[PDB]
Amino acid sequence: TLNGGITDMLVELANFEKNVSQAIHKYNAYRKAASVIAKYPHKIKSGAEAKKLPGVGTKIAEKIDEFLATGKLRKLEKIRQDDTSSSINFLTRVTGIGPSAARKLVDEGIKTLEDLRKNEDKLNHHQRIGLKYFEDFEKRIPREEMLQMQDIVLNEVKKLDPEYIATVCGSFRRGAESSGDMDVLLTHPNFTSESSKQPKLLHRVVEQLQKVRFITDTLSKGETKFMGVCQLPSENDENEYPHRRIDIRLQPKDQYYCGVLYFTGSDIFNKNMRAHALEKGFTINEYTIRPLGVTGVAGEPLPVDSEQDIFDYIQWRYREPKDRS
Template identity: 55%
Template sequence: MSKRKLQPSASNPNQDYCDFLLELADFEKNVSRNIYKHNAYRKAASALSRHPVRVSSGSEARQLPGVGRKIADKIDEFVQTGRLGKLDKIRASDEAVAIGQLSRVSGVGPAKARELFSAGVTSLEELRRRPELLNHHQSLGLRYVSEFEARIPRTEAAALEGHVCSRLAALDPLYCATVCGSYRRGAESSGDVDFLLTHPAFTSSVNEKPARGSSANQKPAKGSAANQKPAHGAAANEKTGGQLLRAAVDQLKNEGFITDTLSHGDTKFMGVCLLPGERYTVHRRIDIRLVPHDQYFCAVLYFTGSDEFNRQMRAHALEQRFTLNEYTLRPLGATGTPGEPVPVTSEEEIFEYLQYPYRRPEERSL
């Protein structure tokens, strides 16, 4: 089920532990459908990957955040036997192996993988012989499965970011795009490159209008701020997310950078891209999420992560009588009801509001 196995190395002396934990995480997500265990295994693997020395026992591993007794027991079993009984059983299950393989395809979730298995598909090779079972996104995901799984070196991720930002600036210098996730936290390689995009003409108040449609009784979109004023200079030039995202994607398509579309909504685009130049030969999946301008820096903070850093910062926000999420920072009233979003024009301002020492993105991998 695991995409590849690596031995302990100087860069990650606990790589083999991380491998089996991530394989267990995939099983829990795709086969058992237990997201709680999935997240627990991934959190433990993340803590082990950042630990600078080799862990020699479960009790030693338990000193790390996110490593509980059951995971520590698995580490002890692996140290003593060089294998894991639970993984042996998983690998002996035709259904588990098939679902793990099929779930590698972009657009094929656990439910679709089970459906394919029920239809007699047990491998990627068999799936390639049954194209009628896949939609457009899944067909492209199957075509590029190996390329999408390849890690993206930091130098290439930086080139992707630079190319997208320069092409959007040529279209309209008011576009702003940021690559978040582990790349922004300084990782040497990334699994994907996800862009957050914004423009002053698109605010949460603009976003709410199409969400409401013609019904006066329809609830506002999640995270919207109905009474918040648009960014300075944007009121007279309001644009919907669909207009702005479509223009941005068309610009990148015209340059030949985006080669295929996986899906395209009003505020989220997923596609396939390839950097120009002979040195770039691997197609990458590109995700572009358009965020209202007044919510952009809360989104940048949230999608930069890490998950543990976000959890700690949200807990601190509550202590300071604020509620913080990917959309807004809001003060809590005397009854605990969130008030209107406070204006945020940078990540640093969020830290200042919360009286929380600023941490640069590369200091947030907890």
């Protein structure tokens, strides 16, 4: 280009006056300056040459002049900041606050982490702890620490009851050098899809994990899923281990490996695996795999005793989790 940087700036400016301002006659103005400058066959070197062109006003020349000196524009910086549909996506980075809540805070004035902490009365318990450990929850968890966390969790589970099965899933299970959090899939032969719902099989693990000081906060304690906060034991060291997000999911025995498969995923891998079951005439859920007919009529859930059965069913060779990108 000769003037791309100017027209880019100008069009973005224009779309603000139509989207956000609904001041449509400044849209039309900014557009005019884009078209002419875009048709002007020389490289603009300052704002006054533009002001000549029958569409670049003083204020636009006033705008263009800034862009060619710094390499940026102050007007567009704060507009990119104050976007309602981008400030909503930063508030959702706090656990507990979905877009539902994120909408509820932004147009009421609160849109920043400082302003979130300027009005804690407007946010529930889950959201408050999420807001408190926010920076910690930003951090990655090195594999080293994941391996330690796994030790604690898996040792406590086995001690409680040999019949419990616990698998740490997610990118960790795919052998990733770092993780965002920990997600434990847990089952017990007393809990099946036909059986009567058994919240204490989950409760007992969570409580033991609190007893040994690994679990430090509860965000969400359900009947089949726990969401909370956890922390490695230190001794006493400058900035000890940061607080980590942990989830524990209790699944029915007969639906467990479908769960492990799903939660170990990779998103992309799960999609590709599901499309493929579908090509072979099977449907895969995080709970079951079933024959699928002609129409979307699904049949009876097939027996799964391992991740391997599911691969067998859809005619794939087993994939190591490490190879599930």
